[PDB]
Design a protein around this nucleic acid. Sequence first.
RNA 1: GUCAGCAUCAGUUUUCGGGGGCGGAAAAAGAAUAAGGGAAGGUGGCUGUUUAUAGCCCUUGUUGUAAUACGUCCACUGGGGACUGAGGACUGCGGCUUCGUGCCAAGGAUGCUGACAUAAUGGU
RNA 2: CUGCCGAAGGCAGAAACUCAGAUCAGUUUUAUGUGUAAAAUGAGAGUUUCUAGUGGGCCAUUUUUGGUAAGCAGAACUGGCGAUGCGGGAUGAACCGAACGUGAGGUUAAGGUGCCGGAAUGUACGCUCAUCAGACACCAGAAAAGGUGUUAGUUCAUCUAGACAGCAGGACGGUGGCCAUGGAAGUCGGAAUCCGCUAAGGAGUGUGUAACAACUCACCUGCCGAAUGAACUAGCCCUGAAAAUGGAUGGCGCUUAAGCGUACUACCCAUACCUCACCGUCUGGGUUAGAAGCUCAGACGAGUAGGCAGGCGUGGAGGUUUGUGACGAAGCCUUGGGCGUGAGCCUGGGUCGAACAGCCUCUAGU
RNA 3: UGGCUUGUGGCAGCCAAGCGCGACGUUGCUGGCUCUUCCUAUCAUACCGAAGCAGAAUUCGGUAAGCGUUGGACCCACUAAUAGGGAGCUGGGUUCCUACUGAUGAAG
Lengths: 168, 21, 30, 196
Amino acid sequence: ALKEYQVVGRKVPTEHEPVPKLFRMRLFAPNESVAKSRYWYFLKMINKVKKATGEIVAINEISEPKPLKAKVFGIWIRYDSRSGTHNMYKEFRDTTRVGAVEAMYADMAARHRARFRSIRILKVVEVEKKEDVRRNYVKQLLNPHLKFPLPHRRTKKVFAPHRPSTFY
Amino acid sequence: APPAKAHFVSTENNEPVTLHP
Amino acid sequence: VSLKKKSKRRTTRLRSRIEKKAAESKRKQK
Amino acid sequence: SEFQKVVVIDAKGHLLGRLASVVAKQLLGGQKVVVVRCEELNISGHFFRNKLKYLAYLRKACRYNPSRGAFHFRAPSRIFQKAVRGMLPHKTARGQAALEHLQAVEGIPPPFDKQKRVVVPAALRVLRLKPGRKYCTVGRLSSEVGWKYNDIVAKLEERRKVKSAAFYQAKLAKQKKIASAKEASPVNQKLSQFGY
RNA sequence: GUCAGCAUCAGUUUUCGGGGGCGGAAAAAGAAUAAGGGAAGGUGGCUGUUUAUAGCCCUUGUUGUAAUACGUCCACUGGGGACUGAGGACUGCGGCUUCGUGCCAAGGAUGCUGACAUAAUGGU
RNA sequence: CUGCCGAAGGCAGAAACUCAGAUCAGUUUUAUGUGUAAAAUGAGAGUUUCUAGUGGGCCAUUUUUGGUAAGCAGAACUGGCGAUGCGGGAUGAACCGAACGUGAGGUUAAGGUGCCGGAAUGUACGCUCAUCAGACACCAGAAAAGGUGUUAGUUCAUCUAGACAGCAGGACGGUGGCCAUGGAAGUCGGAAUCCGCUAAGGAGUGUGUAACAACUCACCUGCCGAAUGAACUAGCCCUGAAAAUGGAUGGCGCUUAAGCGUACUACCCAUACCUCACCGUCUGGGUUAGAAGCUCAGACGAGUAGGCAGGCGUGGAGGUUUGUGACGAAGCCUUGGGCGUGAGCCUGGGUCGAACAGCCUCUAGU
RNA sequence: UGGCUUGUGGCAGCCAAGCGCGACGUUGCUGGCUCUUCCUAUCAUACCGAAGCAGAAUUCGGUAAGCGUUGGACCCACUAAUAGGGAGCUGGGUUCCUACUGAUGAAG
């Protein structure tokens, strides 16, 4: 699965730069090693800081402060496509930022044939205001009187003696 | 060259800044 | 049943020839 | 889920490929299988496409002695047998013996209409097909590919359902009598703490 | 002589279970209980409002030094199954034992028992 | 017959002796600019001498120039093949794993878990319906694009001052503006295309009329109450042509997949990996209590050309076995038994009738 | 022995959806005699759509390969039509088994 990490890093201090600036990024990766490499290439492509002359100063996994409250997360991401450039913004209702990112990765691999390396996440933000929600299906979930029967009921022990119920 | 030794990295002077790709 | 006019399965010369000439196409566009 | 000598499967509402695969695995396990009522097997895909599939199957024939050419079987039971045997190693003695353990029939003949008929949930269309999907019936594809015994089976099935309904009503009445005497008996409440 | 069963072991190995530390935001949550803030997908009330005859969200205190969760470790431990028994007096390295021809899971299996012999194994 | 070493597109081995070395490396650092020089790791490193076989070619890789509808041609390096069995890709000289003694057990790689087929008709989230779907494999030839198929997005639009649509109505009067004509009044046809009114009626969007007239939009008002529209991108789907007997994602078949994409577990097995036994080769230690022997330990095992070593069998000769034999030699047959990895050897039974064999040497029309 | 192959020519300019190119457009000039089967890319026959199609006759296009596509020296007749292709024999020109078809035949 995925875990959210904060990676703080800087280049090695020298005489030219006695106090190098400290760069922190919030990013998602299965483990710390992938997170550090994910961060290093991001730092290379944004600020041209080489991996050799830099160092990861702080690694910290982050847990969801309120995993028991359903939230709506809007995700700004950039995609590499045939043209090599695209921008998308999706909304997912889930109780955890990590799960929202996992759902985003599954949806994009399902729709646009996107892989982990092809997807770079710009921002995952929480949308508390109902009006700020843009997606109609999210608004459908947010309606106060939501109700619906179970979808995809679908139901070793081969050779059942009776016919299936698949109803109530 | 040996591996880099443990040291300190004071941030009160330069607090970490959020970077987004 | 296949239900096709052209077989979906390919011959070994044909499948090998794609990697022969697909690589050359990348050489040409380079 | 216990080894019986003979398993009678009422193929109504099942999917041809899924039921064939389950049956083909049971035959290699060494179990006699009787698949009754084969004119009710369901196949995914709309009827016109399935008939085009079958009519393409007729096209396969020898250019010398079509008598030795492919044998196109039109009965729904034989259609199921062809599906099953394609999932078996019938070129060997093991697969050939496995085929001998399968009896696929049209309707429910009298030797098997008085026996319990289990169903396979892994092949049932209701549990395995998304609602709103077009399908077809083998007993219908057979009639428009050459099978000429549809009316007789339907008539003999209406008779069978009438007789079975009369039998069930008699058995239900006897079961009601036994059920009424059940709570009348005392030990059924006296020491029923074991859950029975 | 043949084939078995079990027990105690040694080598290899697979599969469940318990106990205990140690780390992270000294988990995050959560519960219970005191402040303040905000409101809703607006409850009682009267479409509109701010806990009332439902409640929710945010911050802080507290119960607290809570648990859990994951990671990690134990020279902590309880079981189940399978393959193997090479070597052939004595030394060696070790632990108990007061030393002891002392004992021991410590430089490679022993012990107990049963059935069959016209059967069983093995060969063709 | 077996074992060991083992290529080549100057090699591999053999013998003769250096130093227990800073002596070399299909290597990486440090310094100076792929060259050179002076830390890491690994390895015992070497020198002269002679002597078998080969000096070819196929495939792919990255560096360029000449190129054309279109491929293509010529270089350098790199590997694989060739001497190479095994697992998988339905099967295969060049694809993915893996380098091979005889076995037992465990675990995997690549690929897989609907049935054929050993292994989850597992879990979770999406996409897709194809009257000639997909499982294909940079989807590269057709390829540029079409679609009132679907799901997502990106950028601009109006919207309880009532959105789009829908019904009701207005959509005018100067004016039949002017040339143009049988007949043209906005609408056969030639430049616009102005104005009074507005909330709006375009010298007029189309149909139509010989000409008219009449209807429509494009433009506004009444009712009606909420979202709606346009242009692009992405995934799947249809199409983007192909013939000639039957027909192939390998087959059966599969449509909340057994197709496509991702994520997570569980599971399957190669000669591969690990533990053990055994065979052989090499190497190392020890051995005065068949020395051509004994003993302990470790590593290793494809193999063509080629090199080295040890054995099995056949005819004859010398020596030996107080050797075997008419109470049955040799030979031959055999569903008998035993030994050796093997060449082969011994033996039981039957037949048979007069010679034959082991050991150490010699020899060859072996 | 290319998933080959088929219906739309060559040069220049103007645009210009867009990314110096730039698509469509737009303008400038000179071998025959008999034989089994298959494909449709249909000549005729069947049924349809369009056209100044009044009728008759006809043109083009669609589904369609079920069934036909001749007789004589490109020529001239017949015919509804004389459509196009794939997978035993002869002329002028250079100096065993297996298949196919019929026939028996032991056997639950």
